[PDB]
PDB file of C-alpha atoms in Angstrom:
ATOM      1  CA  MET A   1       0.000   0.000   0.000  1.00 11.90           C
ATOM      2  CA  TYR A   2       0.903   3.676  -0.103  1.00 12.13           C
ATOM      3  CA  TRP A   3      -0.017   6.505   2.271  1.00 10.56           C
ATOM      4  CA  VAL A   4      -1.140   9.789   0.699  1.00  9.21           C
ATOM      5  CA  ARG A   5      -1.463  11.434   4.143  1.00  7.66           C
ATOM      6  CA  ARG A   6       0.542   9.304   6.530  1.00  9.13           C
ATOM      7  CA  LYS A   7      -1.595   7.043   8.709  1.00 11.33           C
ATOM      8  CA  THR A   8      -4.780   8.958   7.686  1.00 11.61           C
ATOM      9  CA  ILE A   9      -5.536   7.901   4.111  1.00 14.22           C
ATOM     10  CA  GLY A  10      -3.829   5.533   1.722  1.00 15.86           C
ATOM     11  CA  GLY A  11      -4.367   3.315  -1.270  1.00 15.47           C
ATOM     12  CA  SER A  12      -3.698  -0.178  -2.581  1.00 18.76           C
ATOM     13  CA  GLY A  13      -4.614  -2.691  -5.216  1.00 17.07           C
ATOM     14  CA  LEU A  14      -6.686  -5.830  -4.596  1.00 16.43           C
ATOM     15  CA  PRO A  15      -4.907  -8.287  -2.306  1.00 15.67           C
ATOM     16  CA  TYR A  16      -4.585 -11.864  -3.469  1.00 15.96           C
ATOM     17  CA  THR A  17      -3.472 -13.304  -0.118  1.00 15.51           C
ATOM     18  CA  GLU A  18      -4.185 -12.759   3.551  1.00 15.83           C
ATOM     19  CA  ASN A  19      -0.483 -11.906   4.017  1.00 10.80           C
ATOM     20  CA  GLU A  20      -1.099  -8.666   2.154  1.00  9.97           C
ATOM     21  CA  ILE A  21      -4.021  -7.803   4.453  1.00 10.82           C
ATOM     22  CA  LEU A  22      -1.880  -8.493   7.518  1.00 11.46           C
ATOM     23  CA  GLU A  23       0.683  -6.047   6.144  1.00 15.11           C
ATOM     24  CA  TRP A  24      -2.023  -3.379   5.842  1.00 15.41           C
ATOM     25  CA  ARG A  25      -2.780  -3.900   9.527  1.00 13.57           C
ATOM     26  CA  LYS A  26       0.903  -3.616  10.428  1.00 12.92           C
ATOM     27  CA  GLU A  27       1.060  -0.312   8.509  1.00 11.33           C
ATOM     28  CA  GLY A  28      -1.771   1.124  10.604  1.00 10.88           C
ATOM     29  CA  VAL A  29      -4.809   0.450   8.428  1.00  6.08           C
ATOM     30  CA  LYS A  30      -8.023   0.214  10.449  1.00  3.52           C
ATOM     31  CA  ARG A  31     -10.776   0.645   7.820  1.00  2.00           C
ATOM     32  CA  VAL A  32     -11.003  -0.402   4.158  1.00  2.00           C
ATOM     33  CA  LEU A  33     -13.058   1.117   1.342  1.00  2.00           C
ATOM     34  CA  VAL A  34     -13.446  -1.694  -1.206  1.00  2.00           C
ATOM     35  CA  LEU A  35     -13.978  -0.337  -4.734  1.00  5.70           C
ATOM     36  CA  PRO A  36     -13.783  -3.360  -7.118  1.00  6.71           C
ATOM     37  CA  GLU A  37     -16.933  -4.881  -8.504  1.00 10.53           C
ATOM     38  CA  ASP A  38     -18.106  -8.274  -7.306  1.00 10.91           C
ATOM     39  CA  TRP A  39     -16.806 -10.037 -10.424  1.00  8.95           C
ATOM     40  CA  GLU A  40     -13.303  -8.678  -9.775  1.00 10.73           C
ATOM     41  CA  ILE A  41     -13.334  -9.753  -6.111  1.00 12.24           C
ATOM     42  CA  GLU A  42     -14.862 -13.154  -6.879  1.00 14.58           C
ATOM     43  CA  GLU A  43     -12.031 -14.020  -9.246  1.00 14.02           C
ATOM     44  CA  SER A  44      -9.527 -13.729  -6.350  1.00 10.12           C
ATOM     45  CA  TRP A  45     -11.648 -14.639  -3.312  1.00 12.73           C
ATOM     46  CA  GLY A  46     -14.576 -16.760  -4.529  1.00 15.74           C
ATOM     47  CA  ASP A  47     -17.226 -14.644  -2.861  1.00 16.54           C
ATOM     48  CA  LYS A  48     -17.381 -10.954  -1.966  1.00 12.69           C
ATOM     49  CA  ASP A  49     -18.835 -11.719   1.463  1.00 17.11           C
ATOM     50  CA  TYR A  50     -15.943 -14.082   2.192  1.00 14.84           C
ATOM     51  CA  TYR A  51     -13.423 -11.423   1.249  1.00 19.54           C
ATOM     52  CA  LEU A  52     -15.090  -8.839   3.517  1.00 17.93           C
ATOM     53  CA  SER A  53     -15.141 -11.445   6.301  1.00 18.64           C
ATOM     54  CA  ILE A  54     -11.377 -11.916   5.917  1.00 19.07           C
ATOM     55  CA  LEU A  55     -10.963  -8.144   6.276  1.00 16.86           C
ATOM     56  CA  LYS A  56     -13.101  -8.195   9.443  1.00 11.44           C
ATOM     57  CA  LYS A  57     -11.267 -11.255  10.787  1.00 11.62           C
ATOM     58  CA  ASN A  58      -8.105  -9.145  10.537  1.00 11.72           C
ATOM     59  CA  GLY A  59      -9.622  -6.342  12.608  1.00 10.59           C
ATOM     60  CA  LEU A  60     -10.495  -4.059   9.671  1.00 12.33           C
ATOM     61  CA  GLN A  61     -13.857  -2.403   9.123  1.00 12.22           C
ATOM     62  CA  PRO A  62     -14.875  -2.615   5.441  1.00  8.54           C
ATOM     63  CA  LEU A  63     -17.337  -0.846   3.186  1.00  9.54           C
ATOM     64  CA  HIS A  64     -18.056  -2.090  -0.354  1.00  6.50           C
ATOM     65  CA  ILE A  65     -18.797   0.686  -2.887  1.00  7.68           C
ATOM     66  CA  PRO A  66     -18.313  -0.934  -6.304  1.00  7.37           C
ATOM     67  CA  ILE A  67     -16.988   1.276  -9.117  1.00  5.33           C
ATOM     68  CA  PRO A  68     -16.375  -0.116 -12.639  1.00  5.17           C
ATOM     69  CA  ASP A  69     -12.849  -0.085 -14.057  1.00  6.58           C
ATOM     70  CA  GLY A  70     -12.042   3.308 -15.551  1.00  8.82           C
ATOM     71  CA  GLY A  71     -15.027   4.822 -13.806  1.00  5.75           C
ATOM     72  CA  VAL A  72     -16.099   7.086 -10.995  1.00  8.40           C
ATOM     73  CA  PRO A  73     -18.524   6.877  -8.098  1.00  8.98           C
ATOM     74  CA  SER A  74     -22.074   7.970  -8.711  1.00  6.78           C
ATOM     75  CA  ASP A  75     -23.158  10.983  -6.661  1.00  7.31           C
ATOM     76  CA  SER A  76     -24.848   8.798  -4.014  1.00  6.96           C
ATOM     77  CA  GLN A  77     -21.829   6.509  -3.898  1.00  3.77           C
ATOM     78  CA  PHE A  78     -19.544   9.524  -3.526  1.00  4.47           C
ATOM     79  CA  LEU A  79     -21.554  10.995  -0.668  1.00  4.49           C
ATOM     80  CA  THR A  80     -21.422   7.599   1.059  1.00  2.00           C
ATOM     81  CA  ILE A  81     -17.666   7.297   0.421  1.00  2.00           C
ATOM     82  CA  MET A  82     -16.877  10.724   1.822  1.00  2.00           C
ATOM     83  CA  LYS A  83     -19.067  10.283   4.891  1.00  2.00           C
ATOM     84  CA  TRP A  84     -17.266   6.961   5.467  1.00  2.00           C
ATOM     85  CA  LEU A  85     -13.780   8.411   5.070  1.00  2.00           C
ATOM     86  CA  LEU A  86     -14.505  11.426   7.283  1.00  2.00           C
ATOM     87  CA  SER A  87     -16.548   9.539   9.954  1.00  2.00           C
ATOM     88  CA  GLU A  88     -13.412   7.993  11.420  1.00  2.00           C
ATOM     89  CA  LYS A  89     -10.571   9.888   9.894  1.00  2.00           C
ATOM     90  CA  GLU A  90      -7.526   7.781  10.886  1.00  2.00           C
ATOM     91  CA  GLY A  91      -6.274   4.567   9.309  1.00  2.00           C
ATOM     92  CA  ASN A  92      -8.275   4.604   6.082  1.00  2.00           C
ATOM     93  CA  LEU A  93      -7.290   2.483   3.108  1.00  2.00           C
ATOM     94  CA  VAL A  94      -9.000   2.678  -0.283  1.00  2.00           C
ATOM     95  CA  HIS A  95      -8.409  -0.065  -2.835  1.00  2.00           C
ATOM     96  CA  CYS A  96      -9.441  -1.035  -6.326  1.00  2.00           C
ATOM     97  CA  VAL A  97      -7.821  -3.693  -8.553  1.00  2.00           C
ATOM     98  CA  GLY A  98      -4.589  -1.933  -9.497  1.00  2.00           C
ATOM     99  CA  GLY A  99      -4.700   0.867  -6.937  1.00  2.00           C
ATOM    100  CA  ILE A 100      -4.104   3.449  -9.676  1.00  2.00           C
ATOM    101  CA  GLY A 101      -7.185   4.707 -11.534  1.00  2.00           C
ATOM    102  CA  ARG A 102     -10.193   4.199  -9.307  1.00  2.00           C
ATOM    103  CA  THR A 103      -8.364   4.512  -5.997  1.00  2.00           C
ATOM    104  CA  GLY A 104      -6.280   7.428  -7.223  1.00  2.00           C
ATOM    105  CA  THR A 105      -9.430   9.279  -8.219  1.00  2.00           C
ATOM    106  CA  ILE A 106     -11.054   8.785  -4.826  1.00  2.00           C
ATOM    107  CA  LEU A 107      -7.871   9.866  -3.011  1.00  2.00           C
ATOM    108  CA  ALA A 108      -7.462  12.963  -5.207  1.00  2.00           C
ATOM    109  CA  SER A 109     -11.109  13.873  -4.599  1.00  2.00           C
ATOM    110  CA  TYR A 110     -10.542  13.529  -0.851  1.00  2.00           C
ATOM    111  CA  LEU A 111      -7.675  16.034  -1.050  1.00  2.00           C
ATOM    112  CA  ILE A 112      -9.746  18.430  -3.153  1.00  2.00           C
ATOM    113  CA  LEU A 113     -12.539  18.359  -0.593  1.00  2.00           C
ATOM    114  CA  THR A 114     -10.507  18.336   2.635  1.00  2.00           C
ATOM    115  CA  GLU A 115      -7.583  20.606   1.677  1.00  2.00           C
ATOM    116  CA  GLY A 116      -9.033  22.751  -1.092  1.00  2.00           C
ATOM    117  CA  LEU A 117      -6.433  21.663  -3.606  1.00  2.00           C
ATOM    118  CA  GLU A 118      -6.828  22.409  -7.278  1.00  2.00           C
ATOM    119  CA  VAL A 119      -7.356  19.334  -9.464  1.00  2.00           C
ATOM    120  CA  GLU A 120      -3.842  19.246 -10.897  1.00  2.00           C
ATOM    121  CA  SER A 121      -2.262  19.671  -7.464  1.00  2.00           C
ATOM    122  CA  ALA A 122      -4.412  16.917  -5.965  1.00  2.00           C
ATOM    123  CA  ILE A 123      -3.491  14.510  -8.770  1.00  2.00           C
ATOM    124  CA  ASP A 124       0.183  15.413  -8.341  1.00  2.00           C
ATOM    125  CA  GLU A 125      -0.002  14.808  -4.576  1.00  2.00           C
ATOM    126  CA  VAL A 126      -1.339  11.287  -5.126  1.00  2.00           C
ATOM    127  CA  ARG A 127       1.194  10.650  -7.887  1.00  2.00           C
ATOM    128  CA  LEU A 128       4.048  11.379  -5.454  1.00  2.00           C
ATOM    129  CA  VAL A 129       3.270   7.997  -3.882  1.00  2.00           C
ATOM    130  CA  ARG A 130       1.281   6.260  -6.678  1.00  2.00           C
ATOM    131  CA  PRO A 131       2.681   6.904 -10.168  1.00  2.00           C
ATOM    132  CA  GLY A 132      -0.046   7.166 -12.799  1.00  2.00           C
ATOM    133  CA  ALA A 133      -2.855   7.765 -10.301  1.00  2.00           C
ATOM    134  CA  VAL A 134      -6.060   8.972 -12.016  1.00  2.00           C
ATOM    135  CA  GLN A 135      -6.148   7.243 -15.390  1.00  2.00           C
ATOM    136  CA  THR A 136      -9.185   8.097 -17.516  1.00  2.00           C
ATOM    137  CA  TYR A 137     -11.023  10.981 -19.115  1.00  2.00           C
ATOM    138  CA  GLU A 138     -14.072  10.167 -17.002  1.00  2.00           C
ATOM    139  CA  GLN A 139     -12.007  10.276 -13.809  1.00  2.00           C
ATOM    140  CA  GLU A 140     -10.479  13.638 -14.748  1.00  2.00           C
ATOM    141  CA  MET A 141     -13.901  15.094 -15.560  1.00  2.00           C
ATOM    142  CA  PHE A 142     -15.223  13.863 -12.206  1.00  2.00           C
ATOM    143  CA  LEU A 143     -12.431  15.612 -10.326  1.00  2.00           C
ATOM    144  CA  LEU A 144     -13.164  18.842 -12.206  1.00  2.00           C
ATOM    145  CA  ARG A 145     -16.783  18.625 -11.122  1.00  2.00           C
ATOM    146  CA  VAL A 146     -15.935  17.846  -7.488  1.00  2.00           C
ATOM    147  CA  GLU A 147     -13.570  20.815  -7.305  1.00  2.00           C
ATOM    148  CA  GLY A 148     -16.171  23.156  -8.736  1.00  2.00           C
ATOM    149  CA  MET A 149     -18.767  21.837  -6.288  1.00  2.00           C
ATOM    150  CA  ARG A 150     -16.561  21.671  -3.194  1.00  2.00           C
ATOM    151  CA  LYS A 151     -18.792  23.832  -0.993  1.00  2.00           C
ATOM    152  CA  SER A 152     -21.972  21.925  -1.741  1.00  2.00           C
ATOM    153  CA  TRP A 153     -20.248  18.550  -1.343  1.00  2.00           C
ATOM    154  CA  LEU A 154     -18.955  19.529   2.087  1.00  2.00           C
ATOM    155  CA  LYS A 155     -22.377  20.803   3.169  1.00  2.00           C
ATOM    156  CA  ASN A 156     -23.957  17.489   2.200  1.00  2.00           C
ATOM    157  CA  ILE A 157     -21.169  15.381   3.704  1.00  2.00           C
ATOM    158  CA  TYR A 158     -21.400  17.086   7.087  1.00  2.00           C
ATOM    159  CA  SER A 159     -25.194  17.163   7.196  1.00  2.00           C
ATOM    160  CA  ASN A 160     -26.604  14.681   9.691  1.00  2.00           C
TER     161      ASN A 160
END
């Protein structure tokens, strides 16, 4: 894995073994935002529920918000993601399959919202620790929209 903001938020690809999950725990991960789709998880773990149970067995709290490869969260997914990541701010890991496109987009969007970074600066901050982070046109357009809508996103995230 890689930390974008040390011990607060980081990223990874999809683990294939429990050893990798143990290493997340050793690094200080406490909570995992699982972005792959069921079919991607099932290839490596048989069943999505089994995979989440292995995360829980290892003392990690998971949330499954499936995003297709090359894609972006829907608005409801994004609200749910940001409430999750800001609910308990320390020890958050986000992962997709490669840890580059989908995860990089979520991590960049987190920096835009929390720190007020411009899009290019947020992408660059993730790329310091994850080369190539944020891969597709759709992901770039999503970040543009999030930046432009920062105030309204924060209002909705911190409501209730």
